[PDB]
Design a protein around this ligand. Structure first.
Ligand SMILES: CCCCCCCCCCCCCCCCCC(=O)OC[C@H](COP(=O)(O)OCCN)OC(=O)CCCCCCCCCCCCCCCCC
Ligand SMILES: CCCCCCCCCCCCCCCCCC(=O)OC[C@H](COP(=O)(O)OCCN)OC(=O)CCCCCCCCCCCCCCCCC
Ligand SMILES: C[C@H](CCC(=O)O)[C@H]1CC[C@H]2[C@@H]3CC[C@@H]4C[C@H](O)CC[C@]4(C)[C@H]3C[C@H](O)[C@]12C
Ligand SMILES: C[C@H](CCC(=O)O)[C@H]1CC[C@H]2[C@@H]3CC[C@@H]4C[C@H](O)CC[C@]4(C)[C@H]3C[C@H](O)[C@]12C
Ligand SMILES: C[C@H](CCC(=O)O)[C@H]1CC[C@H]2[C@@H]3CC[C@@H]4C[C@H](O)CC[C@]4(C)[C@H]3C[C@H](O)[C@]12C
Ligand SMILES: C[C@H](CCC(=O)O)[C@H]1CC[C@H]2[C@@H]3CC[C@@H]4C[C@H](O)CC[C@]4(C)[C@H]3C[C@H](O)[C@]12C
Ligand SMILES: C[C@H](CCC(=O)O)[C@H]1CC[C@H]2[C@@H]3CC[C@@H]4C[C@H](O)CC[C@]4(C)[C@H]3C[C@H](O)[C@]12C
Ligand SMILES: C[C@H](CCC(=O)O)[C@H]1CC[C@H]2[C@@H]3CC[C@@H]4C[C@H](O)CC[C@]4(C)[C@H]3C[C@H](O)[C@]12C
Ligand SMILES: C[C@H](CCC(=O)O)[C@H]1CC[C@H]2[C@@H]3CC[C@@H]4C[C@H](O)CC[C@]4(C)[C@H]3C[C@H](O)[C@]12C
Ligand SMILES: C[C@H](CCC(=O)O)[C@H]1CC[C@H]2[C@@H]3CC[C@@H]4C[C@H](O)CC[C@]4(C)[C@H]3C[C@H](O)[C@]12C
Ligand SMILES: C[C@H](CCC(=O)O)[C@H]1CC[C@H]2[C@@H]3CC[C@@H]4C[C@H](O)CC[C@]4(C)[C@H]3C[C@H](O)[C@]12C
Ligand SMILES: C[C@H](CCC(=O)O)[C@H]1CC[C@H]2[C@@H]3CC[C@@H]4C[C@H](O)CC[C@]4(C)[C@H]3C[C@H](O)[C@]12C
Ligand SMILES: Cc1ncc(COP(=O)(O)O)c(C=O)c1O
Ligand SMILES: [Zn+2]
Ligand SMILES: [Zn+2]
Ligand SMILES: [Zn+2]
Ligand SMILES: [Zn+2]
Lengths: 332, 334
């Protein structure tokens, strides 16, 4: 290739990135209050409405094995992408709290639109990093319970065990810049792409499992999942090696306070930049709207995104935000 | 001051004063509670145990009682919403997927919750029978006290007040056997903590620190008994005679498999109908069962055994009915 890879430090995984500036802790004894201010049932329902998905009232449809691409936002980074036959899910979280505990931790103010049961045949599942807001043991458990060997768990290096331990066999571990495929539908290609984030689920396990983005290269359309990352070259590299991608899921939340999050989390503007670097035709906007993992107003990220869109000479068509549970079909 | 089984405190914690109790407990361990019922694909359970969408979701109005009657809605396990005398009170609210102190281990419901805390009408009081994780849900407590405030009057047994306050609740009332209180505004309704034969445990060495029991709400139009968790005991004739006749009775009819083991903490359907006769209620509702797997019996068995015991005693399904998850039922009185 020609795009820097990694390449771990003496012991754990470094980002190898320049925008990488230390600062890595937790959320129980530091800048962790908020300014989002979420309250009032009807108010939430109004501002942030939860849409009942289609694969519930009319499962039939599904498939989208046509030639375009259908996407559904089930919260935070939980997006179901119906593309080139395959029906894959990303960073699946269907539980109320994203904490190792049930007594403390972040609880969603906007519940998961559907339930794993209601879910349609899930083919592959993609995992950005190990953070609880992206890895929900309960969710994982259910998935295999329902499906099982027929679930291509595409995971980053350092997760296999966890998966297998949870009770999964169809699991692939990958170092960013690696590649693998869904057995049956081998035509489509999945690639672990780099990113700028951290990995931690317990103590001392810091950056023990790699982080990164996913790039689904399918015969017809192409999709890119960033996950959680701060602005770092890679993106362009990706947009070059692969791309032009069709749709891309870019995080637009958890950015304030900038002085601390900047290096681990992009800002709505930085996202617009990714839209460009990755060379996609459109973007869906992941993270935001579901959990309060920062101090930014919970409604701010879409406003800041449209601000940056108009700054960069773009339009809300190019980088759109879905409603909780909404689907969207893009036939190119 | 008639013969009234009072407490009920031995060594340090409370024992069950009732004669038929024998402590040889072992604690919930999936061992004999994981699957001897073996619930298959959701679909199967959708056919057998359909989850309904409670009335107050589609019609948030209509949710009082207009008096001269009694409305009840079954939300899972032992969660029961009772409306009477300008009062909507909950019992044993569990709206969480798993009934455990952990998120990695414990019994997880196979039937989703009918509604959510955001969707239910104004609750005026919650009743807690005992402290077990299938009847006391931390997240549910929080959610409730987050929606509501000092308007939610939490009626809990003796030894729970501190727990409640530590959750953030301020309008909390602690009661002992045959103890009575009321909702601040509505005085005519009187809530009474009445005996039962169960145990209490959430952590290690806290066994029987808090007390168990049953609730007898005496409103000026409709008397409502709610049993909670219990094996058969004589305190139910006391409850049924002192108060009563009652209009409804939320009786448990599930989790009774290793009769040798669970007979002193959990009634079977036969003892459940025995309960119905004892408390002298006009109607009774089947609670517990169908939601969690807390024993080995087949998950559909308890209603069948309920009907068998009903016809044994010369009663029809009218007197003792089982509802679907989320179904409601209205009961007008003389
Ligand atoms: C005393 C013992 C310790 C008690 C602490 C127990 C409570 C822990 C609460 C953890 C809350 C996790 C919140 C969800 C999560 O993973 O997100 C936080 C972070 C990644 O989130 P991101 O979207 O990247 O941006 C947020 C910016 N901070 O990801 C993380 O912070 C990673 C998770 C760290 C969790 C620490 C807890 C370790 C396990 C404790 C028990 C060990 C004792 C036995
Ligand atoms: C050492 C580490 C220990 C790890 C164990 C952690 C997992 C515990 C799982 C508990 C599952 C509870 C099941 C729900 C529940 O409360 O019901 C069981 C019982 C009352 O249930 P009931 O309907 O009366 O019928 C059951 C028949 N015996 O109620 C009970 O039995 C009460 C629950 C007893 C278990 C207490 C939890 C363990 C202690 C936590 C602190 C440990 C940290 C230090
Ligand atoms: C503040 C209490 C203890 C209070 C005391 O000193 O008595 C301490 C005890 C254990 C500490 C936690 C251990 C894990 C983490 C270590 C980090 O470095 C900061 C965040 C976390 C999540 C800590 C939060 C906080 O620093 C805690 C909860
Ligand atoms: C729940 C127990 C004990 C309750 C009791 O004995 O009454 C208490 C005792 C010590 C408490 C911990 C002290 C350190 C931390 C302090 C924070 O403010 C909340 C999180 C932690 C990690 C606490 C969690 C929890 O509140 C603990 C473990
Ligand atoms: C056992 C009680 C719950 C008792 C109850 O619900 O009444 C719970 C409540 C708070 C829980 C603690 C929260 C902080 C920690 C989180 C970790 O994930 C595991 C260890 C700790 C220290 C937990 C230990 C244990 O899980 C506690 C103490
Ligand atoms: C303890 C239960 C199983 C108990 C039983 O069979 O009854 C097991 C089953 C799945 C196990 C988890 C699998 C994923 C993780 C593997 C890690 O290396 C340790 C932590 C986790 C989160 C494990 C913790 C724990 O060991 C669990 C929850
Ligand atoms: C609290 C027990 C102590 C009991 C024992 O020694 O068995 C210790 C011992 C083994 C410990 C685990 C070892 C594997 C992991 C190492 C991480 O760096 C911290 C989290 C994990 C998941 C640990 C969690 C916790 O710190 C455990 C469970
Ligand atoms: C099975 C392990 C350890 C066995 C070993 O070390 O080989 C033991 C050690 C700690 C034990 C638990 C302690 C807490 C609880 C005490 C109850 O009175 C019985 C259920 C529980 C939940 C116990 C279940 C089980 O007995 C455990 C988990
Ligand atoms: C911290 C990991 C989760 C790690 C992951 O998700 O990968 C979890 C997985 C299993 C969890 C333990 C389960 C058994 C115990 C339950 C008690 O109620 C509190 C202490 C213990 C010992 C728990 C502590 C902590 O909650 C653990 C060790
Ligand atoms: C999660 C850690 C270790 C993780 C690791 O070393 O990678 C493991 C190590 C020891 C494990 C415990 C051993 C005793 C128990 C055995 C049971 O069969 C499941 C529950 C308990 C309470 C276990 C819960 C949990 O699974 C622990 C605490
Ligand atoms: C430690 C958190 C709050 C931490 C924070 O500030 O975020 C507190 C807030 C409410 C606390 C719980 C209140 C009910 C219980 C009281 C018991 O005496 C100890 C266990 C429980 C389950 C407590 C565990 C723990 O002490 C919690 C969960
Ligand atoms: C080790 C700390 C602190 C010791 C102290 O305050 O002296 C203590 C303080 C409170 C203790 C917890 C309180 C709630 C529970 C009490 C149970 O009966 C045993 C398990 C738990 C979960 C306890 C475990 C542990 O023993 C804790 C967390
Ligand atoms: C794992 C888990 N915990 C808790 C809940 C319920 O959330 P809450 O108790 O906050 O209402 C769910 C609901 O689906 C869940 O999946
Ligand atoms: Zn993250
Ligand atoms: Zn995140
Ligand atoms: Zn119980
Ligand atoms: Zn029970």
């Amino acid at each position: 290739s020609k795009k820097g890879k990694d390449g771990r430090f003496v012991n754990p995984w470094p980002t190898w990135k320049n925008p990488s500036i230390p600062n890595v802790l937790r959320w129980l004894i530091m800048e962790k209050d908020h300014s989002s201010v979420p309250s009032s049932k009807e108010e939430l329902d109004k501002e942030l409405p939860v849409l009942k998905p289609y694969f519930i009232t009319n499962p039939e449809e599904a498939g989208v094995r046509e030639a375009g691409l259908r996407v559904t936002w089930l919260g935070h980074a939980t997006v179901m992408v119906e593309m080139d036959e395959l029906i894959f899910l990303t960073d699946p979280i269907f539980s109320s709290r994203a904490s190792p505990s049930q007594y403390m931790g972040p609880k969603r103010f906007r519940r998961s639109p559907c339930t794993i049961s209601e879910l349609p045949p899930i083919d592959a599942v993609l995992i950005s990093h190990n953070h609880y807001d992206h890895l929900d043991y309960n969710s994982v458990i259910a998935l295999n319970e329902r499906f099982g060997n027929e679930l291509r768990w595409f995971v980053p290096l350092g997760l296999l065990d966890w998966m297998q331990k949870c009770g999964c066999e169809n699991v692939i571990e990958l170092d960013w810049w690696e590649e693998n495929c869904v057995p049956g539908h081998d035509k489509v290609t999945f690639v672990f792409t780099p990113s700028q984030h951290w990995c931690k689920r317990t103590l001392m396990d810091d950056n023990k499992v790699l982080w990164g983005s996913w790039s689904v290269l399918g015969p017809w359309n192409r999709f890119f999942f960033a996950g959680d990352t701060g602005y770092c070259p890679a993106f362009e590299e990706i947009g070059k090696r692969f791309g032009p991608f069709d749709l891309a899921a870019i995080p637009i939340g958890a950015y304030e306070p900038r002085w601390f999050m900047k290096y681990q989390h992009v800002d709505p503007e930085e996202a617009v930049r990714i839209h460009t670097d990755v060379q996609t035709k459109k973007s869906m906007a992941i993270h935001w709207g579901t959990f309060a993992l920062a101090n930014e107003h919970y409604l701010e990220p879409p406003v800041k995104l449209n601000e940056a869109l108009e700054r960069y000479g773009l339009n809300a068509e190019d980088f759109f935000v879905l409603k909780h549970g909404e689907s969207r079909y893009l036939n190119n």
